[PDB]
Amino acid sequence: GEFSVCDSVSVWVGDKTTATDIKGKEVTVLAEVNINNSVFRQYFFETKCRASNPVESGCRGIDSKHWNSYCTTTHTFVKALTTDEKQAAWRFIRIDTACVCVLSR
Amino acid sequence: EFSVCDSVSVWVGDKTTATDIKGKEVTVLAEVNINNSVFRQYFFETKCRASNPVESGCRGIDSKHWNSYCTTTHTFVKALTTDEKQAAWRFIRIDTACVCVLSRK
Numbered sequence: 001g002e003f004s005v006c007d008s009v010s011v012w013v014g015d016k017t018t019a020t021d022i023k024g025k026e027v028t029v030l031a032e033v034n035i036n037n038s039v040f041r042q043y044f045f046e047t048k049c050r051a052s053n054p055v056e057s058g059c060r061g062i063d064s065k066h067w068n069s070y071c072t073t074t075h076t077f078v079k080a081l082t083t084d085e086k087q088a089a090w091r092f093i094r095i096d097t098a099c100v101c102v103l104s105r
Numbered sequence: 106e107f108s109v110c111d112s113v114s115v116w117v118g119d120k121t122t123a124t125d126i127k128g129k130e131v132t133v134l135a136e137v138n139i140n141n142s143v144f145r146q147y148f149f150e151t152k153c154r155a156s157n158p159v160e161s162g163c164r165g166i167d168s169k170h171w172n173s174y175c176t177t178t179h180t181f182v183k184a185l186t187t188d189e190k191q192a193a194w195r196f197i198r199i200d201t202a203c204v205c206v207l208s209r210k
């Protein structure tokens with residue numbers, strides 16, 4: 001009978017094209033690799049905020065009196081086959097992974 | 106500005122155990138040696154620094170109405186693994202954020 005402080009929405013992404021790698025550069029993701037008609041697809045599991053303000057006080061369950069709060073997406077790093085158009089390689093790329101509550105006194 | 110739960114982030118290069126996307130417990134092959142080329146699987150994980158940042162539970166929570174604690178959440182990354190039978194690439198869950206969980210008092 002639990003509530004999250006922030007409302008998430010997850011999807012699978014099988015068609016990712018563009019991304020930022022762990023070094024802050026913009027890279028292209030190779031969705032599929034076709035080897036002798038055997039196809040390897042890259043899928044990513046992303047979680048994103050629904051609203052930045054679920055409740056109107058910002059986050060849910062916050063002591064609205066002392067703090068203001070909002071909901072916001074944070075990322076993690078996932079390895080992925082990529083190019084920078086100079087080179088094809090596996091690069092840790094940045095991935096939306098959760099919705100978290102940020103405080104402001 | 107300030108987070109409701111505190112995070113800690115680690116690069117894990119020696120993973121052995123994991124749970125795949127089907128709930129099966131699988132072994133991770135952290136290190137593969139081919140000819141004289143070693144392949145070490147690297148993962149970026151984020152865990153809770155504490156389940157109770159403040160005594161109440163999560164920081165900032167309306168402690169009157171609300172019970173709360175901090176806990177990890179996960180994405181799914183492809184990892185080279187084994188169960189009893191076969192070696193393969195399986196989606197396994199890895200910790201990626203620390204979020205606050207509510208419960209009505």
Ligand SMILES: CCCCCCCCCCCCC(=O)OC[C@@H](O)COP(=O)(O)O[C@@H]1[C@H](O)[C@H](O)[C@@H](O)[C@H](O)[C@H]1O
Nearest residue numbers: 040041079089090091143144145146147183193194195
């Ligand atoms: C629906 C059915 C789907 C079936 C799923 C099948 C998918 C099979 C995919 C197999 C691809 C394996 C691969 O081809 O992956 C190699 C590639 O990931 C390794 O490259 P890299 O990460 O750069 O290697 C590290 C190095 O291990 C480490 O020691 C170093 O410290 C790092 O600096 C760095 O060099």
